[PDB]
């Protein structure tokens, strides 16, 4: 119960010896470490340090472990004080966590000379000048793969075929219309060339990264690696499917699946997330905002059904009703709540317009509620980087 | 209620103005002030279906203001609501 | 730039999806993906002129998401800009 007086640059603190003896390995808890700061003339330990911080340091012992940074003390100054008083790494870790930090991962190429060296120019654009060159090519290939995918839909190219004037329908022109290009070992089609090249490179990176990464176990954990894989699956799956159904009838039977994978090709857009800090922040934001994102969808869903129902019935007893059923009116309800208002469906009766009015207002409020939170998350992740 | 009230005030002011501005026109899309309420709400909430649009210069000036006044009108009370929800 | 970039990503994703969803239709309002960019930007900014609208169920589902994604997409970067201005 003996009392101890600690003088922080003139500010007088007082506690019991048993309170400090609680944490022996700290400066104030160890007699041999604090001995240096004792003033036998005044019977106190004197520290020529930051005043605002010590309050929390002392409370740490009194509370039995609570290390809270005072609102008025800069994190950089408080952290230095925690280290000076030698509170330990456990307390420090507990502290940074609460302060919103923590996180350190990433092994490193073991096969030195080879692996580690390659994994640096295929994972760290700053590792060297050559590393940058590679990353730049990736963007070029990605952008090109996108521009090409889009041009495959341009009428100037697809409407110029053997069945362009409603004549007959050839099997080769049919699969080319479905897939987007001509799959031929003769590499005649310019789109199949560009697409093949791009996939050669996408396949390359994916392969390298795989046979050159530290942990080949936590590989399909990284969302980035998933993207890389999803970016080539369509190509090979299309090859497999067409070769396994090389006849009109068979293709016609597997066309839907082929079509689906064509749409999937667009996901290659996300390959850019490996070279975009903003796109990565958005990813972290959405990941952190599932609850609100779902809440948005849910509320919107509730509103869609309520207003679709009301507008349906309000327009029901009309010969020129633009609302065939409640499900059909969903479109109108979403178009109104998001306030897009195309105008392809509009109520014509007084009751319909009253319902419509409310629908628009309810939309603004409905969307306005969850977004703010999402915007905050984004803002957090965005600044905690810049 | 404050939102509804302000919106109500705006609806009546702009419906009235657009009505008269389009009144002396053979192809007026605004039969009466009450009918124009629809146009006013559709413009202030910025939904803009386009089933009713002014065709005269005075009508378009009224329309322009209506859109801007809408954004401000709705923007004032919502924040508070968003806070409560938050 | 972040705004433009995100908008760009969204434009291409939704233009692509709406294109294919409306592809197997005789009265398709979407000749190609690049042509649909216009529709995608008009929907995401929620301007919605209505000169291009999906007619199939899949197109409308894509359209619905496009509108919502637009609001969120634009809402993320603006706040910062508004702060700077303030
Ligand atoms: C559409 C958009 C797709 C966006 C994909 C974005 C992929 C981003 C992949 C990625 O790099 O994520 C790592 C974190 O992973 C994570 O927490 C995991 C994030 C998972 C996100 C899942 C999103 C699913 C969306 C459906 C980043 O760590 P890092 O140290 O660089 O952070 C530094 C930063 O905090 C500033 O200091």
Closest residue in A to C60 (Cα–Cα): A331
Which DSSP symbol is given to A145?
Answer: H
Between CA A3 and CA A9 the distance in angstroms is 19
B18's CB contacts (< 8 A; 6+ apart) are: B30, B36, B39, B40, B54, B59, B62, B63, B66
**DSSP β-bridge partners for residue A148:** none
- Hey, how many other C-beta atoms are within 10 angstroms of the C-beta on A159? 13
For domain A113-275, the CATH superfamily is Voltage-gated potassium channels. Chain C (1.20.120.350)
Question: Rg of chain B over CA atoms, in angstroms?
Answer: 14
Resolution, in Å, please? 2.5
Whether ligand 1 lies within 6 angstroms of the CB of A15 is answered as: no
Q: How far is A332 from chain B (nearest CA, A)?
A: 11
Whether ligand 1 lies within 6 angstroms of the CB of A385 is answered as: yes
Experimental method: X-ray
Between CA A262 and CA A125 the distance in angstroms is 31
Between CA A60 and CA A86 the distance in angstroms is 12
Is B1-86 a domain of CATH 1.10.287.70? yes
Between CA B16 and CA A386 the distance in angstroms is 51
* CATH of segment(s) A1-101: 3.30.710.10
Three-state DSSP class for residue A8 = strand
B12's CB contacts (< 8 A; 6+ apart) are: B33, B37, B40
Q: Residues in chain B, how many?
A: 86
Q: Is the dihedral of CA A200, A203, A205, A207 positive or negative?
A: negative
Are residues C25 and A148 in contact, defined by beta-carbon separation less than 8 angstroms? no
Whether ligand 1 lies within 6 angstroms of the CB of A306 is answered as: no
Between CA A242 and CA A262 the distance in angstroms is 13
Distance of CA A158 to the CA centre of its chain: 36
Between CA C23 and CA C29 the distance in angstroms is 9
Domain boundaries, chain C: 1-86
Could you tell me how many CB contacts below 8 A there are between chain A and chain C?
88
Q: With 0-12 CB in 10 A as exposed, 13-18 as middle and 19+ as buried, what is A262?
A: buried
In chain A, beta strands by DSSP E: 3-8, 11-16, 38-39, 44-47
Tell me phi and psi for residue A14, to 5 degrees: -140, 135
Domain A276-386 is of which CATH architecture? Orthogonal Bundle (1.10)
Alpha-helix runs per DSSP H in A50-170: 51-63, 75-84, 89-98, 115-118, 129-151, 155-158
Regarding beta strands A11-16 and A44-47, do their DSSP bridges make them parallel or antiparallel, or are they unpaired? unpaired
Token representation of residue A188: 């005649």
Nearest atom of ligand 1 to the alpha carbon of A283: 4
Between CA A262 and CA A256 the distance in angstroms is 10
Between CA A64 and CA A42 the distance in angstroms is 28
Neighbours of chain B (3+ CB pairs under 8 A): A, C
Closest CA to B85 of A368, A105, A223, A309: A368
Are residues A22 and A61 in contact, defined by beta-carbon separation less than 8 angstroms? yes
For a mutational test of ligand 1's pocket, the pick from A283, A292, A381, i.e. the residue with the most ligand atoms closer than 8 A to its C-beta, is A283
Could you tell me how many CB contacts below 8 A there are between chain A and chain B?
47
Q: How far is B74 from chain A (nearest CA, A)?
A: 9
Over the range B27-41, which residues count as b (16 or more CB within 10 Å of their CB) and which as e? ebbbeebeebbbbbb
How far, in Å, are A140, A339, B58 from residue A275 at the CA level? 11, 34, 52
Q: With 0-12 CB in 10 A as exposed, 13-18 as middle and 19+ as buried, what is A6?
A: buried
Q: Residues in chain A, how many?
A: 386
Whether ligand 1 lies within 6 angstroms of the CB of A223 is answered as: yes
Q: How far is C85 from chain A (nearest CA, A)?
A: 16
Query: Which residues of chain A make contact with B38, given a CB cutoff of 8 A?
Result: 353, 356-357
Tell me phi and psi for residue A5, to 5 degrees: -115, 125
- The count of C-alpha atoms lying within 13 angstroms of the C-alpha of B59, restricted to the half-sphere facing its C-beta, is 21
Whether ligand 1 lies within 6 angstroms of the CB of A287 is answered as: yes
A143's CB contacts (< 8 A; 6+ apart) are: none
């Amino acid at each position: 119960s003996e009392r101890v007086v600690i003088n922080i640059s003139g500010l007088r603190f007082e506690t019991q010896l048993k309170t400090l003896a609680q944490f022996p390995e700290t400066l104030l808890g160890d007699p041999k470490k604090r001995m240096r700061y004792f003033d036998p003339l005044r019977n106190e330990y004197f520290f020529d340090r930051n005043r605002p911080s010590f309050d929390a340091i002392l409370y740490y012992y009194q509370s039995g472990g609570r290390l809270r940074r005072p609102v008025n003390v800069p994190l950089d100054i408080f952290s230095e004080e925690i280290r000076f008083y030698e509170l330990g790494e456990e307390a420090m870790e507990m502290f940074r966590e609460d302060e919103g930090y923590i996180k350190e991962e990433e092994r490193p190429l073991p096969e030195n000379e080879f692996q580690r060296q390659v994994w640096l120019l295929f994972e760290y654009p700053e590792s060297s000048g050559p590393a940058r060159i590679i990353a730049i090519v990736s963007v070029m290939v990605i952008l090109i793969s996108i521009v090409s995918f889009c041009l495959e839909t341009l009428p100037i190219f697809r409407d110029e075929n053997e069945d362009m004037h409603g004549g007959g329908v050839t099997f080769h022109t049919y699969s080319q219309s479905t897939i987007g290009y001509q799959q031929s070992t003769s590499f005649t089609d310019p789109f199949f060339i560009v697409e093949t090249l791009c996939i050669i490179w996408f396949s390359f990176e994916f392969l390298v990264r795989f046979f050159a990464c530290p942990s080949k176990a936590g590989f399909f954990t990284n969302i980035m690696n998933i993207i890389d894989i999803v970016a080539i699956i369509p190509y090979y799956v299309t090859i497999f499917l067409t070769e396994s159904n090389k006849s009109v009838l068979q293709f016609q039977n597997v066309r839907r699946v082929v079509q689906i994978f064509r749409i999937m090709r667009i996901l290659r857009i996300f390959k850019l997330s490996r070279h975009s800090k903003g796109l990565q922040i958005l990813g972290q934001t959405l990941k952190a905002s599932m609850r609100e994102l779902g809440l948005l969808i849910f509320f919107l869903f509730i509103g869609v059904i309520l207003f679709s129902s009301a507008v349906y019935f309000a327009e029901a007893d009309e010969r020129d009703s633009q609302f065939p059923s409640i499900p059909d009116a969903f479109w109108w309800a979403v178009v109104s709540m998001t306030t897009v208002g195309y105008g392809d469906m509009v109520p014509t009766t007084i009751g319909g317009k009253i319902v419509g009015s409310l629908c628009a207002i309810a939309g603004v409020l409905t969307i306005a509620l969850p977004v703010p939170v999402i915007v905050s998350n984004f803002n957090y992740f965005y600044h905690r980087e810049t």
